[PDB]
DNA sequence: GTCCCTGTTCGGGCGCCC
DNA sequence: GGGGGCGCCCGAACAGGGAC
């Protein structure tokens, strides 16, 4: 087979990625893939005369994961459909990457390391020979194979949707339960998008009020007046004029009181004008609320979110992968993108576990928040 | 020795080496031997290149700038193999290679760079790896590595630690068998050119390794022996935490802080006499015979930490009561404020993740905390935090949020407004406060920031309240710092505060908008705004 | 942007190993 | 007047958010 030569970017090197502490289980499981690997010819054993490195891990049968994050980064440079479907199901195709050699001249760039209990060994690295999983430039190479394999498929069955990210194939259908089910089967042979809700902003309703209770209100109110133009806290901050004690109650007036009711109004409706641009970078933002319950945001500029919602359900840290990975998925299927997460977690914190919860095929880019808490209390 | 060569380069638009330079007799006796041996070669003028050589009866290159045009490579060693890591087996034997790199083939159409010249008051190539070039180590472990592969595929069950040219290699054999396989490892490496002197074949306990002391059944450190200087520079200071660092992988309860943050900014350093208290106490600590065990992994494996005061822990890694595996400590100040939770937490984390190196999974932890005390913890805090699986157990001093805030305000306590302002160009400032019932006040600063004058604004309303008291800030940043909880900081000023925190029965502190015109938040900004 | 401040990575000292 | 690794500590340099 012809092997499509590829490059990185101008002025800018390939990977060279530290390695990361391994459990023996995940050791021993990679051990013994990269073995058959090697055995098959997919990939072969290097030195350091190769400067390059990747970072690799197991999932759990194991699967091996190489984070090529920065490769990603590195290599040179969408239905509407799917996203309206009733029942979305995601499959593993990554193997099939395999089957396709990968030019020479790029292979040293995707040499990873395998690591040693205790370090009994040094490591022993390895490069690949074919079209690796989960890469970026892997999807590319193989489309015009992937097309073809499966358009059958697609002539055959019309309003089923399939749409490709890495390793994953997203294939969505209308069918009805079981029917869904059997035809994914002659797929694999040859999750609903529209249960999404929105998670709207709400303010507290009671009988009495404080001026806590009302400098809590406007303090809410007027963060939200960033996301929503119309909301006002005129009439409700000068029920606070003088200095009160906190616990002090203050009767509302009829023109706050409605004001109020105003601001509970415009907050009842969608925003407006939030238009997903391809070409600009995608970020989610998260938020712990307690409860084992988590807040997150879609957007492209501050304030304009494309998306926002809760997950819900204890573990902070399983929790937070798992709602990094479910809030990815839709980011997927809505918009065929990954987004940079911010977030709240200590660095260390985060990469000391985030691995042993892991089980999608791909790794989106984060950084990590320093957070307010204040945006807390404002998607309650 | 008949190892293939590993192809190396210089960097893409680079040339080799050439810099210029009575040791010169000692350099001639071994140059002259090295290459009879053909460890190196004579060449001519038409070699363009040129790196410096020195002595200290041993010769070695200063090859700095061959090293910069050298190309990158990955080294193979990601770390050092630990004593607590090793399996107890029934014969071990430690081993050395003997001339390791000069064993190992450079590669031929590299060898000119590394040319070389002792002087006139003579040149050479290398033929084998020089010490002192960059790519020699990885080259050698890497090689090292094939070269043991073999035999290691055919001998499944001897352990082999490999590191560099020291080799640990342990089985469940009867000691004759043993020593006929050690012996066919011997020759096994022989016949890829590396000599194992007999004189550094180790075939009794107790066996030098990697800085150890390996007893059958248990394991220490070689003898430590700490520095004591009369004065003290900035780094004998170093110097002497390095091998109290060292120290504290086996002997329990090392402390090092104290001593640490003497280096601040900075020589001759005055042993701070906090400092030396710890320094005695380690002194004494290091007169205790201490030993560790080796690892069973039909065990479990079970940390346990203690808090010796002032963000400064120490734990200890065991299987069975009494006789732990490894000891350990952490000191480490992370934030510009923090609290005993938070440092726990850091502690865990530290120990997990040596854990995983070492054994290749994760302890059961043993802490001071009470669930509660975690639980508690672990709402109020609004970034994710986590522990694993653990027991509490009771050994003061217990691990203590040392004060909280209130979630609700406090019904009749009063009430400051406070707020602070400084003037970027002049550094000047005022802080302040405006109560409920009726109660006024501005301090004005010199030498402050914005950030500073609300830290003072809250510190006022703490010393002028009473036992309760609820406090209304404007700012993000001091809200931020105190409703995380800290207990310790680089910031004097918070410290100050924190002292407040915990006289007091309950303090609530609330958070509104800025320039809202909004409660004495308005009234408040305007006396402390004023000149500002 | 600035200033401030807090977080992280980096490089250098020391330790230890070869 | 040399090299590679891991750890610990520091300050310096840089990124990023809040408040001007
Ligand atoms: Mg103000």
């Not at chain 1, 998008?193 to 809410?220: A, F, R, Y």
């Not at chain 2, 059958?216 to 170093?238: A, F, G, R």
């Not at chain 2, 310790?488 to 002292?499: A, D, G, P, T």
């Amino acid at each position: 087979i012809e092997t499509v030569p590829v490059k990185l970017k101008p002025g800018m090197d390939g990977p060279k990625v530290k390695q990361w502490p391994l459990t023996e289980e995940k050791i021993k499981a990679l051990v013994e893939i990269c073995t058959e690997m090697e055995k098959e010819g997919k990939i072969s054993k290097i030195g350091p005369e190769n400067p390059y490195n990747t970072p690799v891990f197991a999932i759990k049968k194991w699967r091996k994961l190489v984070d090529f994050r920065e490769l990603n980064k590195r290599t040179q440079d969408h239905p509407a459909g799917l996203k309206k479907k009733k029942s979305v199901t995601v499959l593993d195709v990554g193997d099939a990457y395999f089957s396709v050699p990968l030019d020479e001249d790029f292979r040293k760039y995707t040499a990873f390391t395998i690591p040693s209990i205790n370090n009994e060994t040094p490591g022993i690295r390895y490069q690949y020979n074919v079209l690796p999983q989960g890469w970026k430039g892997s999807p590319a190479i193989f489309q015009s194979s992937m097309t073809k394999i499966l358009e059958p498929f697609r002539k055959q069955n019309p309003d089923i949707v399939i749409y490709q990210y890495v390793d994953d194939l997203y294939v969505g259908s209308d069918l009805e339960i079981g029917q869904h089910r059997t035809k994914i089967e002659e797929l694999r042979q040859h999750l609903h998008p529209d249960k999404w809700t929105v998670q709207p902003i709400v303010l507290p309703e009671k009988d009495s009020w404080t001026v806590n209770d009302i400098q809590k209100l406007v303090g809410k109110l007027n963060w939200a007046s960033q996301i929503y133009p119309g909301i006002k806290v005129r009439q409700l901050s000068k029920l606070l004029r003088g200095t009160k004690a906190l616990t002090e109650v203050i009767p509302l007036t009829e023109e706050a009181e409605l004001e109020l009711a105003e601001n509970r109004e415009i907050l009842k409706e969608p925003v407006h004008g939030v238009y997903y641009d391809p070409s600009k970078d995608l970020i989610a933002e998260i938020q712990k609320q307690g409860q084992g319950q988590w807040t997150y945001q879609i957007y492209q500029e501050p304030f304009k979110n494309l998306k926002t919602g809760k997950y819900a359900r204890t573990n902070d840290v399983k929790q937070l992968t798992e709602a990094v990975q479910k809030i990815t998925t839709e980011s997927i299927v809505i918009w065929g993108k990954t987004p940079k997460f911010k977030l709240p977690i200590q660095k260390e914190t985060w990469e000391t576990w985030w691995t042993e919860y892991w089980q999608a095929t791909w790794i989106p880019e984060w950084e990590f928040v320093n957070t307010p808490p204040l945006v807390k209390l404002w998607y309650q | 020795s008949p190892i293939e060569t590993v192809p190396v380069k210089l960097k893409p638009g680079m040339d080799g080496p050439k810099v210029k330079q009575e040791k010169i007799k000692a350099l001639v006796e071994i140059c002259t031997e090295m290459e009879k041996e053909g460890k190196i070669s004579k060449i001519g003028p038409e070699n363009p290149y040129n790196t410096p050589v020195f002595a200290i009866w041993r010769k070695l290159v200063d090859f700095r700038e061959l090293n910069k045009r050298t190309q990158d490579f990955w080294e193979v060693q990601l770390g050092i193999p630990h004593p607590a890591g090793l399996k107890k087996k029934k014969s071990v034997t430690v081993l050395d290679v003997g001339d390791a790199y000069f064993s190992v083939p450079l590669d031929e159409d590299f060898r000119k760079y590394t040319a070389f010249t002792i002087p006139s008051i003579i040149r050479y190539q290398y033929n084998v790896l020089p010490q002192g070039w960059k790519g020699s180590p990885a080259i050698f472990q890497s090689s090292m590595t094939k070269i043991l592969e073999p035999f290691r595929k055919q001998n499944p069950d001897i352990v082999i630690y490999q590191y560099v040219d020291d080799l640990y290699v342990g089985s469940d054999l009867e000691i004759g068998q043993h020593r006929t396989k050690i012996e066919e490892l011997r020759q096994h490496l022989l016949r890829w050119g590396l000599t194992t002197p007999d004189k550094k074949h180790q075939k009794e306990p107790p066996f030098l390794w990697m800085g150890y002391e390996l007893h059958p059944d248990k394991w220490t450190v070689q003898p430590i022996v700490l520095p004591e200087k009369d004065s003290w520079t900035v780094n004998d200071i170093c110097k002497l935490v390095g091998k109290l660092n060292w120290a504290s992988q086996i002997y329990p309860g090392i402390k090092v802080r104290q001593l640490s943050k003497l280096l601040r900014g900075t020589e001759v350093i005055p042993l701070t006499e906090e400092a030396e208290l710890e320094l005695a106490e380690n002194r004494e600590i290091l007169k205790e015979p201490v030993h560790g065990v080796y690892y069973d992994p039909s065990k479990d494996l079970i940390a346990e930490i203690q808090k010796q005061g002032q963000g400064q822990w120490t734990y200890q890694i065991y299987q069975e009561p009494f006789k732990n595996l490894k000891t350990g400590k952490y000191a480490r100040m992370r934030g510009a404020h923090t609290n005993d939770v938070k440092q726990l937490t850091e502690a865990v984390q530290k120990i997990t993740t040596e854990s995983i190196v070492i054994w290749g999974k994760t302890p059961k932890f043993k802490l001071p905390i009470q669930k509660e005390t975690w639980e508690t913890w672990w709402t109020e805090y609004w970034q994710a935090t986590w522990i694993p699986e653990w027991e509490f157990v009771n050994t003061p001093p217990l691990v203590k949020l040392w004060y909280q805030l209130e979630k609700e305000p406090i019904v009749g306590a009063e009430t400051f407004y406070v707020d602070g302002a400084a003037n970027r160009e002049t550094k000047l400032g005022k802080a302040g406060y405006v109560t409920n019932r009726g109660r006024q006040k501005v301090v004005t600063l010199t030498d402050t920031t914005n950030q500073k004058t609300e830290l003072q604004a809250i510190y006022l309303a703490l010393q002028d309240s009473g036992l309760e008291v609820n406090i209304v800030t404007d700012s993000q940043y001091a809200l931020g710092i105190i409703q995380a909880q800290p207990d310790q900081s680089e910031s004097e000023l918070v410290n100050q505060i924190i002292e407040q925190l915990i006289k007091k029965e309950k303090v609530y502190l609330a958070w509104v908008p800025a320039h809202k015109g909004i409660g004495g938040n308005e009234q408040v900004d305007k006396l402390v705004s004023a000149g500002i």
